[PDB]
Amino acid sequence: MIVLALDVYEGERAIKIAKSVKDYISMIKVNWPLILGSGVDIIRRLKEETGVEIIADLKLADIPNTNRLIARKVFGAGADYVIVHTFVGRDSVMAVKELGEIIMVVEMSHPGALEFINPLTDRFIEVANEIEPFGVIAPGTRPERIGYIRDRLKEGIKILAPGIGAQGGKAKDAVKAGADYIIVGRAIYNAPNPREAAKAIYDEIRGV
Amino acid sequence: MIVLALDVYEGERAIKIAKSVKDYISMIKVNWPLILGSGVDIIRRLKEETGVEIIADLKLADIPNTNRLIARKVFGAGADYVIVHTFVGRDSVMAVKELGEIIMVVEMSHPGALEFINPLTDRFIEVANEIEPFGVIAPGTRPERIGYIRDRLKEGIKILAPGIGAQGGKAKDAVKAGADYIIVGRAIYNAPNPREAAKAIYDEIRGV
Ligand SMILES: O=c1ccn([C@@H]2O[C@H](COP(=O)(O)O)[C@@H](O)[C@H]2O)c(=O)[nH]1
Ligand SMILES: O=c1ccn([C@@H]2O[C@H](COP(=O)(O)O)[C@@H](O)[C@H]2O)c(=O)[nH]1
């Protein structure tokens, strides 16, 4: 269930960390920091070095034409999934979905998410239900909201929850609430021993 | 003042276009397509080749920590301004502003913008007024909305309007409505003669 969020700038550093924790993860999530620091080709290299699927957390939020230009390049680089915002509207979301599997942001994990996003959660779930993306982003920092979303989201849609570890969210609470994937970044990549850190979360989720 | 939206993947091609239309533009806007295609260093290259200010249209929309990590690399690469979304919250906006000048999205130009963004325009204007970014994004496709925003937006904040040309917006109307800058991409870079296309729009806005 663990999704490693590799938010370091250095590509070889990312590959080293990924290889050391590969045994305990399900997927790797890359964001702009690593792409900016190593080039988009880092996606293909991570997949070849680890054998796991790659999620490109781009938080796409532009007009349809630009979302298309971006997504085609990133899916072309090997991304298995692309995360897109829902607030920019249906047309921008579809421009990306036409190119590959997507994950729609429903509710974010940080404090600022309560200002405009959280108040529209119901509406976003409605859009996700009609579009039917591979999954949606729910707040690992607010497990009660993960349940809220799960209860209203079509069964076939998965829930991925970031905000575990550094942001304060507990892996066990998120899984119990209905998260299918547990996104973990700093708690693993900033740990003195990333493998030991990943194993601890892996054990927590197994309930041992 | 024309801002060139250089949304092509190829760096040498982008530099050629920029140099050919320099006489008629005031700034160059780089988005993810060019950054992905040529690397973030393309920003430094464009500035060295044209001597014009560069806007990094990243539409940042992540949590505070990640927004900082991204802005660090982009401002570090020479970006004079970074575009960030307001929807994600004030904390995410300030994480970027603490590192350099920003432009906040208030209302977008595509059809999808009417679903969630447009209904919250009043609130977004309020946030922009409190943060005081260099400028905000207003819809070149909806001139009447540009004037609406300008009247309620703090005097010192500039308005940049994309959606001119390809999307149907008219440059004269946007400027007349209160846009300080009009962003133009395809109408220029998709043109057989980029310089001629830029000059035509330049003459269109002369004498507002
Ligand atoms: O609502 C969201 C959406 C995305 N992310 C991303 O998930 C990862 C969380 O990393 P960390 O807080 O475990 O270090 C980062 O890439 C962050 O940008 C969040 O944290 N919260
Ligand atoms: O509300 C917005 C915000 C940003 N952009 C950006 O402005 C440029 C418009 O290019 P074009 O329609 O002139 O080709 C592109 O980079 C697009 O991503 C918009 O078009 N509308």
The structure was resolved to a resolution in Å of: 1.9
PDB experimental method: X-ray
Residues in chain A closer than 8 A to B73 (CB atoms): 9, 33, 36-37
Question: Of all atoms in ligand 1, which is nearest to the CA of residue A166?
Answer: 12
Least CA distance to B86: which residue of chain A? A116
* Choice from B146, B183, B188 to test ligand 2 binding pocket (greatest atom count within 8 A of CB): B183
Tell which residue, A151, A141, A147, A155, has the closest CA to residue A177.
A147
Residue whose token pair is 């085609």:
A72
Domain ranges in chain A are 1-208
**Cα–Cα–Cα angle for B71, B62, B37, rounded to 5 degrees:** 60
Q: How many Cα atoms are found within 13 Å in the side-chain-facing hemisphere of A85?
A: 29
Pairing of strands B102-105, A158-161: unpaired
Which residue has 């310089």 as its token pair?
Answer: B195
List the helix and strand counts (H, then E) for chain B: 10, 8
Is A59 tagged catalytic?
Answer: yes
Chain A residues in contact with B87 (beta carbon < 8 A): 61, 85, 87, 116-117
Q: Using CB atoms and an 8 Å cut-off, which of residues 128-157 of chain B contact chain A?
A: none
Nearest CA to ligand 1 atom 6: A162
Catalytic residue among A19, A22, A59, A199: A59
- E strand map for chain B: 2-5, 27-31, 53-60, 81-84, 102-105, 135-137, 158-161, 181-184
B76 annotated to bind ligand = no
Q: Distance between CA B144 and CA B146 in Å, rounded? A: 5
β-pairing, A53-60 with A81-84? parallel
Q: Contact at 8 Å (CB) between A118 and A77?
A: no
Comparing CA positions, the residue from B111, B141, B87 lying closest to residue A112 is B87
DSSP per-residue letters across chain A: -EEEE---S-HHHHHHHHHHHGGG-SEEEEEHHHHHHH-TTHHHHHHHHH-SEEEEEEEE-S-HHHHHHHHHHHHHTT-SEEEE-STT-HHHHHHHHTTS-EEEE-S-SSGGGGTTTGGGHHHHHHHHHHH--SEEE--TT-HHHHHHHHHHS-TTSEEEE--BSTTSB-HHHHHHHT-SEEEE-HHHHTSSSHHHHHHHHHHHHHT-
3-state secondary structure of B113: helix
> Could you give the maximum distance between any two Cα atoms of chain B, in Å?
44
Q: Which residue of B41, B57, B63, B97 is the best one to mutate when testing the A interface, meaning the one whose CB has the most A CBs within 10 A?
A: B63
Report, at the CATH architecture level, how domain A1-208 is classified: Alpha-Beta Barrel (3.20)
The DSSP H or E segment spanning B196 is: helix B194-205
Please state, in angstroms and rounded to a whole number, the distance separating the CA atoms of residues A127 and A130: 5
Q: Which of A7, A54, A85 to mutate to test the pocket of ligand 1 (most atoms within 8 A of CB)?
A: A7
Nearest one of A121, A109, A180, A115 to A152, comparing CA atoms? A121
The alpha carbon torsion through B85, B86, B89, B91 (nearest 10 deg) reads 80
Tokens linked to B131: 């943060």
Expressed in angstroms and rounded, the spacing between residue A163 Cα and the centre of ligand 1 is: 6
Binding site for substrate: what residues of A are annotated?
7, 29, 57-66, 109, 162-172, 185-186
**Which residues have any ligand 1 atom within 6 Å of their CB?**
A 5, 7, 31, 57, 108-109, 137, 162-167, 183-187; B 62-63, 66
Q: Which residue has the tokens 């990306």?
A: A96
